[PDB]
Amino acid sequence: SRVGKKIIDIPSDVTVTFDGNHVTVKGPKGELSRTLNERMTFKQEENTIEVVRPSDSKEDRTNHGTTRALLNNMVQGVSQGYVKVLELVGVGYRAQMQGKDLILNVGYSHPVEIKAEENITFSVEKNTVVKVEGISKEQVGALASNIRSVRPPEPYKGKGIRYQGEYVRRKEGKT
Amino acid sequence: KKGVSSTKNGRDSESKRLGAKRADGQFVTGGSILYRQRGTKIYPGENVGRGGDDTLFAKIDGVVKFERKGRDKKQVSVYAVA
Amino acid sequence: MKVRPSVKPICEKCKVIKRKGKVMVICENPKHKQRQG
RNA sequence: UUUGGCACCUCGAUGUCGGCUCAUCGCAUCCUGGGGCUGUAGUCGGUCCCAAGGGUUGGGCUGUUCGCCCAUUAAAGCGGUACGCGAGCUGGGUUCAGAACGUCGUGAGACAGUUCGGUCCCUAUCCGUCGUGGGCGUAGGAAAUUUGAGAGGAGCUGUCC
RNA sequence: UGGGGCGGUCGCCUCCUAAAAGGUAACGGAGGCGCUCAAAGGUUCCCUCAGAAUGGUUGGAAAUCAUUCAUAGAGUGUAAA
RNA sequence: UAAGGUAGCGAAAUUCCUUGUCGGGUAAGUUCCGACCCGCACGAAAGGCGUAACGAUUUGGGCACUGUCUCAACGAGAGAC
RNA sequence: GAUUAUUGGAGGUAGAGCACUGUUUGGACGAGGGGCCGGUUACCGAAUUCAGACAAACUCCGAAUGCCAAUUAAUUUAACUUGGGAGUCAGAACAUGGGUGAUAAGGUCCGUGUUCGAAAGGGAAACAGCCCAGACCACCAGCUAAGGUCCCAAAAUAUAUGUUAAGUGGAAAAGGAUGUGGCGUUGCCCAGACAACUAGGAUGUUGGCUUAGAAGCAGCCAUCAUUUAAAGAGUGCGUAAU
């Protein structure tokens, strides 16, 4: 519950406008609205901003940090790209690429197929450098942190969906 | 019910009503009792007989005075002022 | 190492944080802070 | 949900262990189901959690409570309900009077140590449950078709490709 | 008689339960009794502690004896007071 | 002590240890048969052992047979209504 | 006769307390026995002190309160004797004290109070013993008690204050959070507390025992200075050395 060293939340050329309780990421790359909060009154003087902390209640000061870090995620991702690099391995059962999709010869009854995503760039450099470029942590950081769990690296062989900063471990392989 | 066994220790004495029977300032008779004791807790003084069982009586009629006897003991002093 | 009643880590860079509200600890000591009277 | 202790209700009677037929509620789950987790690569074994929705053989051998076995099964659960239910069934058993043995008792007789045999009443008045109709009413009357407030029932599996 | 039950016990005295007067229960706790002293009694005139160490023929330290303190710890016919 | 059970039958209408022991039989035998005796409490005229025949006698096993049963269905009837 | 102010006395409770009796000596203490030849030293019997702790059947001490009686005082209204006629002997629950049982029991036995029995009414949802409280009869009058005041249901959505977030309220024990405040400290402490963002966080040299070789875990450390804003013969999670 220790998060408050950074509470700045400065905007960029992307414009943090309002739509009521809603708040709109606009500008060079934007047009994505989302409600910051109710009490957390946000304000931008010319190009700097920071979440007002009214009364610093438990709820209010947690909402300060929500809106701060989430608008930071916005001005990070909708402006630059919430870009997360990862790799892939699927071995023996014919886990094969299909460009913007995939197939596995898991070789069940029926080998079973896989697909790509929407509004997020799945930029493949060499079929194992996949950049996932989106807009924020809550949902697309959830994408980056769930693609690893989609088919994660099973330890005793090591096939699955890895980050650039991930590894494979092993198991006491005793039936 | 079932086997409950031999059983002994319920033995005690049909008691006796000891101690005093009259009190300070009170006036008495000739064969009147003033105390039922054993041994000497108190010591007959003035006009006091002592029967066999350490029972005390006042030799006269009159009124009582308990008091110290020694430095740490106690007695009686009957007076028949009237 | 060999398992315990629990796991046996102890470290205390104790990120007792809610994930959007679900309280937990992203830490290594689940052995001490419980409810208490 | 053990063995007990207290002696309140019931001795002008609340009258029977079991089993049969029916059930019916729980979960502290046996199967299935899911997840996680291990001295789990999956399985494994095991573990923790979610889980009660349902389902949970047939014979042999003891009145015996009981357990043991033979074959299956996904399993072959634990409990609760006057030790679920006898004004629904049997009574095997125990308790009746006979008789036998062993032991004890001078003996009458007792034990329990066993064994054989030995009588289970009721025309349902009320509530209640299964159904069946009658009555009346639904601001006009009759025929037919209807919405459904809700209520009930339904959901087990395993196998080959 | 915490069902009858087998066991036990059933009459007196001391204590504790008993609650600072006395008094009082329990198949409640502990103990004595079913006598004895013609001297352990009566009455005059004396004595006064065991015990302890002190310690020494003794010595199983100690007996008997002896120095000094000992609370009646002595002891007092019969339990406890 | 007056003396100590002889034959014998034995885990038996009687074994506490105890389904003592161990087969046979059943796929499975808490029994049944058989056998071992470790006979609590075995023994011979309120008799011991074995016997053909006998038995609305007890108990185990088998064959037939079959709605006893799985697994219940139909009919006829008396009741019922 | 009673109640109480005034008495005066008896007495050994509770509590205290070891002073006896003694319950478990921590320590020493010196010896005896003893290991040894009659000795050594251990420890004890025991006692020496110091030293504490304990007590239904221990007491040097010792209450409150109750018992008895006084020109006892005052305010009440009893009190006693005689004799006629009776019923009661299974009591129950609460508080309380005690025993017994299992610091079990809505148990069981005594005791001190109270209620029922023999007593309605109100309150406790209903609720013989709990709380308030006794009815002679009326009465469409009033005042209050226990308890209560948003609806069923009469009364304040009253004031003013607070705490708490659980429907607690309106489920218990141990264990274990700060989950929160508070109350005071704490060591801080504006330089700047205390987790955290993070700065750099490395060696002659594991040196000695180097244990499976092991150079932060299945292990003992002689544990020498810093490279140096802040830092270690390496704070922190590996049981394969790293």
Automatic annotation (TrEMBL), chain A:
<dbReference type="InterPro" id="IPR020040">
    <property type="entry name" value="Ribosomal_uL6_a/b-dom"/>
</dbReference>
<feature type="domain" description="Large ribosomal subunit protein uL6 alpha-beta">
    <location>
        <begin position="89"/>
        <end position="163"/>
    </location>
</feature>
<dbReference type="Pfam" id="PF00347">
    <property type="entry name" value="Ribosomal_L6"/>
</dbReference>
<dbReference type="GO" id="GO:0022625">
    <property type="term" value="C:cytosolic large ribosomal subunit"/>
</dbReference>
<dbReference type="InterPro" id="IPR019906">
    <property type="entry name" value="Ribosomal_uL6_bac-type"/>
</dbReference>
<comment type="function">
    <text>This protein binds to the 23S rRNA, and is important in its secondary structure. It is located near the subunit interface in the base of the L7/L12 stalk, and near the tRNA binding site of the peptidyltransferase center.</text>
</comment>
<dbReference type="GO" id="GO:0002181">
    <property type="term" value="P:cytoplasmic translation"/>
</dbReference>
<keyword id="KW-0687">Ribonucleoprotein</keyword>
<dbReference type="GO" id="GO:0019843">
    <property type="term" value="F:rRNA binding"/>
</dbReference>
<comment type="subunit">
    <text>Part of the 50S ribosomal subunit.</text>
</comment>
<dbReference type="InterPro" id="IPR000702">
    <property type="entry name" value="Ribosomal_uL6-like"/>
</dbReference>
<feature type="domain" description="Large ribosomal subunit protein uL6 alpha-beta">
    <location>
        <begin position="10"/>
        <end position="81"/>
    </location>
</feature>
<keyword id="KW-0694">RNA-binding</keyword>
<dbReference type="InterPro" id="IPR036789">
    <property type="entry name" value="Ribosomal_uL6-like_a/b-dom_sf"/>
</dbReference>
<dbReference type="GO" id="GO:0003735">
    <property type="term" value="F:structural constituent of ribosome"/>
</dbReference>
From TrEMBL, chain B:
<dbReference type="GO" id="GO:0006412">
    <property type="term" value="P:translation"/>
</dbReference>
<dbReference type="InterPro" id="IPR018261">
    <property type="entry name" value="Ribosomal_bL27_CS"/>
</dbReference>
<dbReference type="GO" id="GO:0022625">
    <property type="term" value="C:cytosolic large ribosomal subunit"/>
</dbReference>
<dbReference type="Pfam" id="PF01016">
    <property type="entry name" value="Ribosomal_L27"/>
</dbReference>
<keyword id="KW-0687">Ribonucleoprotein</keyword>
<protein>
    <recommendedName>
        <fullName>Large ribosomal subunit protein bL27</fullName>
    </recommendedName>
</protein>
<keyword id="KW-0689">Ribosomal protein</keyword>
<dbReference type="InterPro" id="IPR001684">
    <property type="entry name" value="Ribosomal_bL27"/>
</dbReference>
<comment type="similarity">
    <text>Belongs to the bacterial ribosomal protein bL27 family.</text>
</comment>
<dbReference type="GO" id="GO:0003735">
    <property type="term" value="F:structural constituent of ribosome"/>
</dbReference>
UniProtKB/TrEMBL annotation, chain C:
<feature type="disulfide bond">
    <location>
        <begin position="14"/>
        <end position="27"/>
    </location>
</feature>
<feature type="binding site">
    <location>
        <position position="11"/>
    </location>
    <ligand>
        <name>Zn(2+)</name>
    </ligand>
</feature>
<keyword id="KW-0862">Zinc</keyword>
<dbReference type="GO" id="GO:0005840">
    <property type="term" value="C:ribosome"/>
</dbReference>
<dbReference type="Pfam" id="PF00444">
    <property type="entry name" value="Ribosomal_L36"/>
</dbReference>
<dbReference type="GO" id="GO:0006412">
    <property type="term" value="P:translation"/>
</dbReference>
<keyword id="KW-0687">Ribonucleoprotein</keyword>
<protein>
    <recommendedName>
        <fullName>Large ribosomal subunit protein bL36</fullName>
    </recommendedName>
</protein>
<feature type="binding site">
    <location>
        <position position="32"/>
    </location>
    <ligand>
        <name>Zn(2+)</name>
    </ligand>
</feature>
<keyword id="KW-0689">Ribosomal protein</keyword>
<dbReference type="GO" id="GO:1990904">
    <property type="term" value="C:ribonucleoprotein complex"/>
</dbReference>
<dbReference type="GO" id="GO:0005737">
    <property type="term" value="C:cytoplasm"/>
</dbReference>
<comment type="similarity">
    <text>Belongs to the bacterial ribosomal protein bL36 family.</text>
</comment>
<feature type="binding site">
    <location>
        <position position="14"/>
    </location>
    <ligand>
        <name>Zn(2+)</name>
    </ligand>
</feature>
<dbReference type="InterPro" id="IPR035977">
    <property type="entry name" value="Ribosomal_bL36_sp"/>
</dbReference>
